[PDB]
Amino acid sequence: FANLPNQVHRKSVKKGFEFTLMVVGESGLGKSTLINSLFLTDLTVQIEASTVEIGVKLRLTVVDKTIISYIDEQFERYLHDESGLNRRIIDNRVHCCFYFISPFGHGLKPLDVAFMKAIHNVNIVPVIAKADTLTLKERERLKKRILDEIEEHIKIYHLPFKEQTRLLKASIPFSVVGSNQLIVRGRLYPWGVVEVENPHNDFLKLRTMLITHMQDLQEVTQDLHYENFRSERL
Amino acid sequence: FANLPNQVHRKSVKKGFEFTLMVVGESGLGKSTLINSLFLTDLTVQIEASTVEIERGVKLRLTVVDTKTIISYIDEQFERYLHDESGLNRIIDNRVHCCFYFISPFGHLKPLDVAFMKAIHNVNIVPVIAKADTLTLKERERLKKRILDEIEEHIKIYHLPQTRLLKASIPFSVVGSNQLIEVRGRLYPWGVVEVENPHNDFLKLRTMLITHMQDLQEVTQDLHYENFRSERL
Numbered sequence: 001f002a003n004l005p006n007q008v009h010r011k012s013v014k015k016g017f018e019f020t021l022m023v024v025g026e027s028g029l030g031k032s033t034l035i036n037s038l039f040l041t042d043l044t045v046q047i048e049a050s051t052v053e054i055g056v057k058l059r060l061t062v063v064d065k066t067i068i069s070y071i072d073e074q075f076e077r078y079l080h081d082e083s084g085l086n087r088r089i090i091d092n093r094v095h096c097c098f099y100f101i102s103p104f105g106h107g108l109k110p111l112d113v114a115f116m117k118a119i120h121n122v123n124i125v126p127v128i129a130k131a132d133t134l135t136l137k138e139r140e141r142l143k144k145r146i147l148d149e150i151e152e153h154i155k156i157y158h159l160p161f162k163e164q165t166r167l168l169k170a171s172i173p174f175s176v177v178g179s180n181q182l183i184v185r186g187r188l189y190p191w192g193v194v195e196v197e198n199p200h201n202d203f204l205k206l207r208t209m210l211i212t213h214m215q216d217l218q219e220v221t222q223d224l225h226y227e228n229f230r231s232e233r234l
Numbered sequence: 235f236a237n238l239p240n241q242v243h244r245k246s247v248k249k250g251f252e253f254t255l256m257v258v259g260e261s262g263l264g265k266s267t268l269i270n271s272l273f274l275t276d277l278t279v280q281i282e283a284s285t286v287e288i289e290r291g292v293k294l295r296l297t298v299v300d301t302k303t304i305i306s307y308i309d310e311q312f313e314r315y316l317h318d319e320s321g322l323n324r325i326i327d328n329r330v331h332c333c334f335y336f337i338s339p340f341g342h343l344k345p346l347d348v349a350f351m352k353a354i355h356n357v358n359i360v361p362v363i364a365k366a367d368t369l370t371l372k373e374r375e376r377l378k379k380r381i382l383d384e385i386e387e388h389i390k391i392y393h394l395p396q397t398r399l400l401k402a403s404i405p406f407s408v409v410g411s412n413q414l415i416e417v418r419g420r421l422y423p424w425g426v427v428e429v430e431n432p433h434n435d436f437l438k439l440r441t442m443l444i445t446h447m448q449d450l451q452e453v454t455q456d457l458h459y460e461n462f463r464s465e466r467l
């Protein structure tokens with residue numbers, strides 16, 4: 001039989017992939033420079049699609065109660081296409097959300113909480129924006145106090161060798177730096193060179209967290225859309 | 235005859251000397267720590283007045299601002315004085331000699347800021363970009379030019395009268411810390427950021443102020459007179 005996972009695997013490369021991630025934070029603490037760095041190409045609601053090969057369809061919906069509305073509009077178009085006489089169906093259900101928190105804050109701000117309370121029923125990855133601004137000791141205090149406030153209020157993406165993947169689940173929320181310019185890519189200060197893909201900055205754990213977990217497809221599919229389905233169909 | 239300048243130089247140290255500075259920006263992009271770095275001591279409207287020696291003692295008052303409430307307070311000081319100046323006996327005047335407005339490195343000049351500065355600048359404004367280590371040097375100057383072009387588009391900032399090099403570097407982009415590593419500065423694992431090095435532009439601002447506490451007269455003649463010429467009418 002063992003040739004049948006093969007069949008699935010051979011099927012997927014032939015066919016696939018698709019994905020749609022959503023970017024909220026605050027204009028501007030490095031969101032469009034970082035989402036560009038993520039995938040090694042460059043690019044009120046505005047949406048942008050583009051393909052990568054190595055085959056991946058990305059719809060990076062950058063958000064430039066209106067957003068509770070769009071992502072939930074998409075639960076509604078898919079409940080529509082399912083039901084549903086002739087089915088082919090293109091799901092632009094947002095697989096993941098990337099909430100950028102700014103490094104100036106003892107803090108996680110009230111807006112950030114207010115928002116995540118509203119949008120935590122899609123998968124949220126909290127990401128600390130522009131971490132070149134943070135000292136190591138400073139980075140640590142911020143990371144812990146964010147996580148602390150999260151259990152104090154907020155469903156988040158509960159994230160599914162061992163020593164290595166423990167470290168990944170630990171360092172969340174990832175602090176990161178983005179840039180298209182390179183000198184090694186590239187933040188040039190007359191005292192030092194900020195170097196993405198090191199930790200230095202948390203860019204590799206996030207980028208690799210995103211790639212290994214594109215079973216966010218399922219989390220979003222089963223947990224969050226069904227609940228809109230159970231909900232409006234009542 | 236020209237000890238007479240020495241007669242004035244002596245009287246001034248023996249009395250000297252006292253100043254008040256006002257802080258507005260945005261909690262928190264480094265305003266409370268920078269100002270500590272600047273005088274070398276750690277410290278709705280709130281004021282902290284502390285006394286510093288160096289033979290001259292400076293009576294430094296520091297009125298930090300947290301968030302129409304602000305112009306009210308800066309102006310009350312004008313009316314406290316107009317009452318007091320015009321009173322029968324003679325006054326301890328807390329007019330705001332000068333304000334540092336703190337602009338954030340997270341802008342390609344924000345609209346709260348232009349709107350705020352518009353209303354107020356009849357108080358001397360020092361525009362200072364906060365936490366300057368955030369900006370790479372090309373972003374540092376590119377941002378400086380956008381503000382500097384945006385500032386004139388509307389805004390009276392405080393006009394600064396080898397004073398040659400300071401004129402260009404304003405608005406200042408400062409980097410404040412009260413930790414200390416291998417001389418004040420910050421510890422990143424790729425490099426080390428020095429307070430006071432230009433590199434930082436904290437030094438240019440530091441001396442901009444000590445060298446100019448003729449901000450004292452600017453307030454007294456131009457800003458207060460007009461409150462007075464105005465409120466009298």
Ligand SMILES: Nc1nc2c(ncn2[C@@H]2O[C@H](COP(=O)(O)OP(=O)(O)O)[C@@H](O)[C@H]2O)c(=O)[nH]1
Nearest residue numbers: 027028029030031032033130132177178187368
């Ligand atoms: N040091 C540092 N500088 C950054 C970082 N991200 C962006 N910058 C710089 O500041 C700008 C950030 O703007 P942008 O990428 O448009 O962020 P956005 O407004 O959220 O889309 C960039 O053009 C860079 O010049 C970062 O992570 N670290």
Ligand SMILES: Nc1nc2c(ncn2[C@@H]2O[C@H](COP(=O)(O)OP(=O)(O)O)[C@@H](O)[C@H]2O)c(=O)[nH]1
Nearest residue numbers: 133261262263264265266267268365367409410
């Ligand atoms: N990158 C950078 N970070 C700073 C600088 N100065 C302070 N910080 C950090 O930001 C915090 C500033 O605190 P504070 O000065 O009280 O901010 P504020 O009072 O809200 O304006 C400190 O805890 C430092 O960790 C700076 O010059 N550059």
